[PDB]
Design a binder for this molecule. Structure first.
Ligand code: CLA
Ligand code: CLA
Ligand code: CLA
Ligand code: CLA
Ligand code: CLA
Ligand code: CLA
Ligand code: CLA
Ligand code: CLA
Ligand SMILES: CC(=CC=C/C(C)=C/C=C/C=C(C)/C=C/C=C(C)/C=C/C1=C(C)CCCC1(C)C)/C=C/C1=C(C)CCCC1(C)C
Ligand SMILES: CC(=CC=C/C(C)=C/C=C/C=C(C)\C=C\C=C(C)\C=C\C1=C(C)CCCC1(C)C)/C=C/C1=C(C)CCCC1(C)C
Ligand SMILES: CC1=C(C/C=C(\C)CCC[C@H](C)CCC[C@@H](C)CCCC(C)C)C(=O)c2ccccc2C1=O
Lengths: 176, 42, 166, 730, 73, 154, 29
């Protein structure tokens, strides 16, 4: 008859989805773009030629210092200031709420018409393919399985085996 | 979605996802150091 | 019935005592870097005076020392409860007798002031922290090594090292 | 209740203090209601004053047992599969010593995992799968791995029938409140169509696939996954494809046969699990009945019928309200279900029904005491719930002047007798032993009660045992041996690893245990009988059905006025039965090993786990810790550093937990209050207590945390004491 | 739990220090040990000796009947 | 060093324990795993209690007779962190169990009807008053004894 | 990894391969 489920912060999950899959937009075409044999072959002897490696897990700091700065300072001030204490405007804070941010403060505001509104027209682009990313990297992020799993010979683990026709990997297409 | 001055609730025994687990991660320190009875330091 | 931010004098002081003894702390280092030479733990025995009489001991070079310090230390306690030290530069800082905007109770957030001459211990705030946390660093990486930086031959890229005990 | 009846929300009740009687859990804070809530969670004097639902809940929250028994069994078939030892053990029984469970070597663990058979580290078993599992007209590890998910199938589905009730808008009255047919169905075709269906998959497939196992092979050098269809050609070895008969009847000729069955009795030399050539016939010969039987019938009629003079006028009318009770038609059941479980516990040990049991000692006595504590833990219950009837269930008093209104009529009476019964027993039923001590410690055997001093003479024999093993010469057809090899007459040769069953002799030291049981079974029942009978009214309190069947105790007056009630008669009646069963167990193994279990070799010079030490020496009730408790148990208190060790290492806790019960059993109540405040004080100074008024235990909760502990203590104590003296010699 | 589990080691077992202690300041002339001001000599008593604590309160370890039995975990 | 014997650097009785006892572990001449890939006494369970050789670390560790190791901890010769090191540790961990005990508690008794908010939990663990504990430098070691919980409230 | 010549000289090859008579199956029978 139906679940009392809609989170109220059901509003948050979705701008958490603009995260996961717009971000995963920068994966589908850089990966499956490849360039097969551009001319041919990658040769990467450069910042990794001969200086005792380069990254790996000093990669993580240099990667996620300013991604720490990027992601960190994102949802914190997407909009919300005011931020204090006592009573509810319902999500699980909304202490900004009725207050935009500052009474008579500065230029807290982006743009005219007493709001944060970047006008009403732009439902066209970011509704379809951009949240399509959600429903695309859903099964095309679940091509993950098909692309590698089956562990190209080398490794069978707790040998049950249980079947044998032929291998499985990735390249595009398929037998049949 | 949770900002400042306490938050959302939780059940009767979320302690059974607190005895099991957290605590559970601790066997996870009691095999990394599979042993105790004093301890080196860092 | 008392609500929130109170403390008054308290440990606003503590910070400015930690950082000023963290600053004058790294002044313990400083020396062995431009002309490197002598450093690490050293067990220094300080700088050492003349060549006449001593030889490794001559008794405790510090216990006799710290009796003096004592009744010139409880004198900040001979201050912090009831303000008194002519210069008047930590308890609230200088400018004479102001900062009673926190001396008589009622802080909440109060940033403060002080120095008839220009600004304040303000960019002599930062220099307080950076030194209190620098020690953090300074006596953090002993336990493994004791020297800072050279050039691009084979040092500033980290090659092979031993890790913690286990 | 309140928010927000009735038509107007879906919107579910998550948030707003309380529910469960009406100045309910009150706004005002407390703790007692957190044992409330769980306790009496199921109950019915609240939920609604109107039957209806309740049967609409119990037919659902029932369901989730089957489903569970079903998630269970799966992790046991899976377990009895890929955590293997079953494959290994079967080509290699007499030899193995089975496992299913194994640790993971975290912390101390591993000691618990100690070479069990077909070449691996693990912890043993006394739960005879690996032996139902003989069955597998097929064999294969991944196979049980289908039977297994076949399990999780029945579950999810036989667990969405419980969504597909209460939560779905439910049936009603008529549906159960017409009973007219129920057993018609049940016994006919399931009781029947299982035992029946079980027949078909009990010679088809199983019989043949252990007809030629009882010899050698290594499986798949036998029993394919289909092989057993139309191919009625291997069914060729184990009798005809009926040759010229057509659908039994007689115009049949036997110049040399008589279909499978050809009735056995005794025990396979090579697998003494009793014969299977029978096991089809007996299940077939069941079902028929059920098949014919479940065809009554439509109800009163038959009970509305035979009355007499002193007999039961109300016999006639023995309950409209037996379509309107539950608490009644549950309590009846428990006495049977329950009393019909520990009848298992015998026909098992003196007639094994699975291949490799007896030889397997420890993997069917565990059984005979597990099955033994249900045929008892379900019986005191079968009384409790009658008390629950006797107090309340019906609306008013519409039920009148009958079999009951009768029994009650006498009541200071049926229980007036029964009493003296017990002190007659007890004096003839225990101080009997105490004679021995006092006079064998005085020491003059001339005059004990020995199987030899007080007049009885080197024979027990002439009674009925000796006219059982010998009855295949009556109307009896026959079939070498008896019915149960443990009977007086004839035969020996049973098994080629260790032993199994043989006669089992009696007289005294069998005579008098058998009698302590009487007095133990009897005074148990006294207290439940008088308990449930005096349920609602009495000449210590008549105003005495006025709350419920619990209530702590009426009040300091009348002298005592404490225990009374019948929660509590079903509190001191557990207290006994824990003995009832706890000493019946003590009986079986001291016999079954003092004699029976023991062992063959040349000239089959029998060598019991103990050369019958029983003889002259259980008769002394010290001999019961000279010969028992201090003798055996030396395996519990040696058990450290081993593989089983988890027993010795329990046997201290749980032999602690019990010795913690007394604190819950033996103490006041405004006591731990008076204490709980000193505490509550020190609490407030730091500012750390008040919210949720911390409170001591609810007089009868206190008794709830006696008892339950006293048992899970005093019991697993032996569950340990046992598995530790059959694993390892015996 | 540690025995039974196979590991006699791992066993938690505190010496009764402040016990034996009371007695190496008595007569428990067990296998030497100084103690800072006492040593087992230099200072002994000085103020006490051949009077009072003679052979008595000098049973020591005496595995038979030494008075004080030699205390452990 | 003190009442029992010396550490691991030598401890005869202790040695014999290593050896019989465990190694009998052995005890199974074979028991089949010539190449086989499960039954793991074989590898470690021994070697994890075993390769614990004439090394266990070295820990000092006194070891009496039968050479099971005794704990002095009197802060001397070697044995200091067999109580204090894991002692302050027990203190610091608790106290930041109940510093927050006296916290996802002293945050309620107010606003509107607050009569069992606690059978559900407002911020799970408190997850707000959470770190207040590691975010105890000094803390109750002053503000407990001066103000708030102030003798007043005493 | 680390490459020297040339992800290959002669590229990937005879690992699916069938070509002149892609036969097996379509064929056999
Ligand atoms: C067909 C049977 C069956 C069914 C369906 C019921 C159903 C019912 N019984 Mg009942 N009962 C039964 C058999 C049954 N009983 C038997 C065999 C006995 C004899 C012991 C009883 C003795 C009994 C009493 C005395 C009472 C009931 C009551 C009830 C009602 C309360 C149910 C409740 O809240 O759960 C109760 C269960 C709990 C609150 C859970 C606590 C269980 C603890 C004690 C654990 C047991 C030990 C175990 C080893 C612990 C787990 C392991 C651990 C160490 C990790 C309910 C209608 C009660 C009532 O007031 O009637 C309306 C009354 O209390 N029953
Ligand atoms: C004037 C003098 C000079 C000044 C500026 C101070 C200032 C101070 N003294 Mg002090 N002191 C002085 C002379 C002085 N002293 C002398 C001559 C002595 C001889 C004992 C002391 C003995 C003394 C002690 C024992 C202490 C101080 C303390 C202090 C500090 C706390 C204030 C206080 O306790 O007043 C006292 C206030 C009163 C109202 C005194 C009550 C008078 C009787 C009649 C009641 C403060 C910085 C305290 C301190 O700093 O500890 C951390 C405390 O330790 N003083
Ligand atoms: C074999 C046992 C068993 C079974 C089949 C049940 C079955 C049931 N219990 Mg129950 N219960 C049990 C043991 C069992 N209990 C024990 C040991 C206790 C401790 C006292 C309780 C305490 C208890 C309470 C307080 C309540 C129930 C309730 C219920 C019913 C509610 C079903 C539901 O709401 O959604 C099913 C939901 C899920 C499957 C979600 C997943 C949750 C985890 C646990 C899996 C259901 C009939 C409720 C009731 O009154 O209904 C009759 C009631 O609130 N039980
Ligand atoms: C009847 C009982 C029930 C019980 C008491 C157990 C108990 C156990 N199972 Mg188990 N299991 C069950 C049903 C059960 N299972 C069912 C229905 C399934 C099918 C889903 C499984 C599938 C399963 C697997 C795959 C494993 C276990 C394992 C285990 C052991 C690991 C302990 C654990 O679960 O937490 C921690 C433990 C002895 C683990 C094991 O055997 O390794 C030691 C293994 O992980 N079980
Ligand atoms: C409830 C029963 C169970 C089930 C589901 C089956 C089912 C089957 N039996 Mg069967 N059988 C059973 C019990 C069962 N049997 C028992 C208890 C016995 C001995 C007492 C037999 C003796 C038996 C024989 C001799 C044969 C079968 C055959 C068959 C198959 C087709 C003929 C038939 O019986 O019904 C369907 C009805 C018709 C086809 C008409 C069918 C798979 C036959 C077979 O292999 O397939 C044809 C034949 O070989 N059975
Ligand atoms: C209470 C009343 C009424 C009376 C006065 C009797 C009297 C009797 N019934 Mg009886 N009976 C009754 C109602 C009654 N019945 C009812 C209503 C039923 C059905 C519920 C029965 C079912 C019944 C059976 C099965 C038997 C009796 C027997 C007997 C007799 C016992 C044998 C005896 O003493 O001689 C023996 C004297 C010797 C010297 C030898 C006795 C005459 C028994 C009988 O038939 O006689 C043995 C038999 O056991 N009755
Ligand atoms: C009656 C009773 C008995 C019972 C059943 C309880 C039950 C409870 N007490 Mg409690 N208590 C008792 C006697 C009892 N107490 C006594 C005699 C005292 C001495 C005054 C206390 C002092 C006390 C304190 C200080 C606290 C509790 C808390 C609690 C709750 C913590 C459980 C929990 O973790 O929540 C669900 C799961 C979690 C909280 C884990 C996340 C629980 C409801 C705690 C509490 O109420 O929550 C803050 C804590 O405040 N009790
Ligand atoms: C438990 C303790 C306490 C008690 C009740 C005693 C009691 C005694 N001590 Mg003693 N003692 C103590 C602590 C104690 N001591 C400590 C801590 C020291 C170390 C400084 C001593 C060092 C000491 C000496 C040197 C002597 C005594 C002696 C004595 C005894 C006689 C004193 C006398 O002549 O007047 C008397 C039994 C005297 C004695 O009679 O001993 C032979 C003398 O020898 N004591
Ligand atoms: C649906 C069906 C069926 C069946 C069959 C069946 C339906 C069977 C069943 C059976 C049952 C059984 C066989 C039972 C069992 C039980 C058990 C096994 C249990 C056990 C136990 C005990 C002892 C107690 C408790 C515990 C336990 C559970 C363990 C069918 C139907 C039909 C139809 C209509 C159509 C045509 C065909 C037919 C066929 C005619
Ligand atoms: C001390 C302890 C424990 C003990 C314990 C003991 C000392 C004992 C116990 C016991 C328990 C039990 C005992 C339970 C159970 C069970 C079971 C599982 C059972 C089963 C069975 C059955 C089935 C029926 C009957 C029989 C038997 C029993 C077998 C602990 C402690 C602690 C601490 C320090 C703190 C924290 C927490 C802890 C960690 C916790
Ligand atoms: C000892 C005893 C008590 C005292 C027993 C008590 C108070 C037991 C209840 C203790 C509760 C179970 C502790 C619950 C606290 C925890 C659940 C809270 C923290 C949550 C966990 C994370 C620890 C009685 O109240 C009593 C009443 C009637 C007859 C006999 C006795 C009796 O013998």
């Amino acid at each position: 008859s139906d679940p009392e489920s809609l989170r109220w912060n059901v509003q948050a999950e979705l701008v958490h989805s603009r995260w996961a899959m717009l971000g995963a937009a920068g994966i589908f075409i850089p990966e499956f773009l490849t360039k097969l044999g551009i001319l041919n072959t990658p040769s990467w002897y450069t910042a990794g030629e001969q200086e005792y490696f380069t990254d790996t897990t000093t990669l993580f700091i240099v990667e996620l210092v300013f991604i720490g700065w990027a992601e960190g300072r994102r949802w914190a001030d997407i909009l919300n200031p005011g931020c204090v204490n006592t009573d509810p405007i319902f999500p699980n804070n909304k202490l900004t709420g009725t207050d935009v941010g500052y009474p008579g403060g500065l230029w807290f505001d982006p743009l005219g018409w007493g709001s944060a509104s970047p006008q009403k027209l732009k439902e066209l682009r970011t509704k379809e393919i951009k949240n399509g990313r959600l429903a695309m990297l859903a099964v095309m992020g679940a091509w993950f399985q098909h692309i590698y799993t089956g562990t190209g010979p080398i490794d069978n683990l707790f040998a049950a085996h249980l079947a044998d026709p032929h291998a499985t990997i990735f390249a595009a297409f398929t037998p049949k | 979605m949770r900002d400042f001055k306490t938050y959302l609730s939780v059940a009767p025994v979320l302690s059974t996802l607190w005895f099991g687990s957290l605590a559970g991660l601790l066997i996870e320190i009691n095999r990394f150091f599979p042993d105790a009875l004093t301890f080196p330091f860092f | 019935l008392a609500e929130d931010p109170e403390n008054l004098r308290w440990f606003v002081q503590a910070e400015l005592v930690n950082g000023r003894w963290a600053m004058l702390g790294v002044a313990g280092m400083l020396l062995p870097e431009v002309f490197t030479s002598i450093g690490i733990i050293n067990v220094p025995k300080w700088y050492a005076a003349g060549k006449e009489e001593y030889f490794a001991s001559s008794s405790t070079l510090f216990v006799i020392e710290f009796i003096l310090s004592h009744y010139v230390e409880i004198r900040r306690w001979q201050d912090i409860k009831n303000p008194g030290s002519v210069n008047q530069d930590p308890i609230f800082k200088q400018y004479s007798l102001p900062a009673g905007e926190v001396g008589y109770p009622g802080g909440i957030f109060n940033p403060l002031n002080f120095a008839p001459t220009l600004e304040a211990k303000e960019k002599e705030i930062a220099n307080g922290r950076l030194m209190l946390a620098f020690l953090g660093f300074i006596i953090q990486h002993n336990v493994t090594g004791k020297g800072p930086f050279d050039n691009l031959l084979q040092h500033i890229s980290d090659p092979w090292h031993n890790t913690i005990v286990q | 209740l309140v928010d927000r009846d009735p038509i107007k929300t879906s919107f579910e009740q998550w948030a707003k203090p309380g529910h469960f009687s009406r100045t309910i859990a009150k706004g005002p804070d407390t703790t007692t209601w957190i044992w409330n809530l769980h306790a009496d969670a199921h109950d019915f004097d609240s939920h609604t004053s109107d039957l209806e639902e309740i049967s609409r809940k119990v037919f659902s929250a029932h369901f989730g047992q089957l489903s569970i028994i079903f998630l269970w069994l799966s992790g046991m078939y899976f377990h009895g599969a890929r955590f293997s030892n079953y494959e290994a053990w079967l080509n290699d029984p007499t030899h193995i010593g089975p496992s299913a469970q194994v640790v993971w070597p975290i912390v101390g663990q591993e000691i618990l995992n100690g070479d069990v058979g077909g070449g691996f580290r693990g912890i043993q078993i006394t739960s005879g799968f690996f032996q139902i599992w003989r069955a597998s007209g097929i064999t294969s590890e991944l196979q049980l791995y289908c039977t297994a998910i076949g399990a999780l199938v029945f579950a999810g589905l036989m667990l969405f029938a419980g969504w597909f009730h209460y939560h779905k808008a439910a049936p009603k009255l008529a549906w159960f409140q017409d009973v007219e047919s129920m057993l018609n169905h049940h016994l006919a075709g399931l009781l029947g169509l299982g035992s029946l269906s079980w027949a078909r998959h009990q010679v088809h497939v199983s019989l043949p696939i252990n007809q030629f196992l009882n010899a050698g092979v290594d499986p798949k050098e036998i029993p394919l996954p289909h092989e057993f269809i139309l191919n009625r050609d291997l069914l060729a070895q184990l009798y005809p494809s009926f040759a010229e008969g057509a659908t039994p009847f007689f115009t049949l000729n036997w110049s040399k046969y008589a279909d499978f069955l050809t009735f056995r009795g005794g025990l396979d030399p090579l697998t003494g699990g009793l014969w299977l050539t029978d096991i089809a016939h007996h299940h077939l010969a069941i079902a028929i009945l059920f098949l014919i039987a479940g065809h009554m019938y439509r109800i009163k009629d038959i009970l509305e019928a035979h009355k007499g003079p002193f007999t039961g006028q109300g016999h006639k009318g023995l309950y409209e309200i037996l379509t309107t009770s539950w608490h009644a038609q549950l309590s009846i059941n428990l006495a049977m279900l329950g009393s019909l479980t520990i009848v298992v516990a015998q026909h098992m040990y003196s007639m094994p029904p699975y291949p490799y049991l007896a030889t397997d000692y420890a993997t069917q006595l565990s059984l005979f005491t597990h099955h033994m504590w249900i045929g008892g833990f379900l019986i005191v219950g079968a009384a409790a719930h009658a008390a629950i009837f006797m107090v309340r269930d019906y609306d008013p008093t519409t039920r009148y002047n009958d079999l009951l209104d009768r029994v009650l009529r006498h009541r200071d009476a049926i229980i007036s007798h029964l009493n003296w019964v017990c002190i007659f027993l007890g004096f003839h039923s225990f101080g009997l032993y105490i004679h021995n001590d006092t006079m064998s410690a005085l020491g003059r055997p001339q005059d004990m009660f020995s199987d030899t001093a007080i007049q009885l003479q080197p024979v027990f024999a002439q009674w009925i045992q000796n006219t059982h093993a010998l009855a295949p010469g009556t109307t009896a057809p026959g079939a070498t041996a008896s019915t149960s090899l443990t009977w007086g007459g004839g035969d020996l040769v049973a098994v080629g690893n260790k032993v199994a069953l043989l006669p089992i002799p009696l007289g005294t030291a069998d005579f008098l245990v058998h009698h302590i049981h009487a007095f133990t079974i009897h005074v148990t029942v006294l207290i439940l009988l008088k308990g449930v009978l005096f349920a609602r009214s009495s000449r210590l309190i008549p105003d005495k059905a006025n709350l419920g069947f619990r209530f702590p105790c009426d009040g300091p007056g009348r002298g005592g006025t404490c225990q009374v009630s019948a929660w509590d008669h079903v509190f001191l009646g557990l207290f006994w039965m824990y003995n009832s069963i706890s000493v019946v167990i003590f009986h079986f193994s001291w016999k079954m090993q003092s004699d029976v279990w023991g062992t063959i070799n040349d000239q089959g010079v029998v060598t019991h786990i103990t050369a019958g030490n029983f003889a002259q020496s259980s008769i002394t009730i010290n001999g019961w810790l000279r010969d028992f408790l201090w003798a055996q148990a030396s395996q519990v208190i040696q058990s450290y550093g081993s593989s089983l060790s988890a027993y010795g290492l329990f046997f201290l806790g749980a032999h602690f937990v019990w010795a913690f019960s007394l604190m819950f059993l033996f103490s006041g109540r405004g006591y731990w209050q008076e204490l709980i405040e000193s505490i509550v004080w020190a609490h407030n100074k730091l500012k750390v207590a008040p919210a949720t008024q911390p409170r001591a235990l609810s007089i009868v909760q206190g008794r709830a945390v006696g008892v339950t502990h006293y048992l899970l203590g005093g019991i697993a104590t032996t569950w340990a004491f046992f598995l530790a003296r059959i694993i390892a010699v015996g | 739990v540690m025995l039974a589990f196979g590991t006699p080691e791992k066993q938690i077992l505190i010496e009764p220090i402040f016990a034996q202690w009371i007695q190496s300041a008595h007569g428990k002339t067990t296998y030497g040990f100084d103690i800072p001001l006492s040593s087992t000599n230099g200072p002994a008593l000085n103020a006490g000796r051949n009077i009072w604590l003679p052979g008595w309160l000098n049973a020591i370890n005496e595995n038979s009947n030494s008075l004080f039995l030699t205390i452990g975990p | 060093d003190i009442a029992g014997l010396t550490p691991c650097k030598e401890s005869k009785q202790f040695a014999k324990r290593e050896k019989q006892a465990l190694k009998k572990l052995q005890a199974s001449l074979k028991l089949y795993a010539d190449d086989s890939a499960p039954a793991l006494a074989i590898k470690a369970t021994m070697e994890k209690t075993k390769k614990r050789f004439d090394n266990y670390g070295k820990y000092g560790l006194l070891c009496g007779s039968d050479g099971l190791p005794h704990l002095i901890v009197s802060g001397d010769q070697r044995h200091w962190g067999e109580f204090i090191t894991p002692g302050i540790l027990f203190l610091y961990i608790a106290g930041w169990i109940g510093w927050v005990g006296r916290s996802y508690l002293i945050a309620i008794r107010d606003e509107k009807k607050p009569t069992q908010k606690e059978i559900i939990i407002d911020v799970p663990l408190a997850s707000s008053l959470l770190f207040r504990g590691f975010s105890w430098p000094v803390a109750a070691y002053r503000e407990l004894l001066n103000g708030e919980l102030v003798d007043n409230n005493f | 990894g680390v490459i020297e010549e040339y992800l290959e000289k002669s590229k990937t090859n005879k690992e699916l391969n069938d070509k002149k008579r892609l036969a097996t199956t379509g064929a056999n029978f």
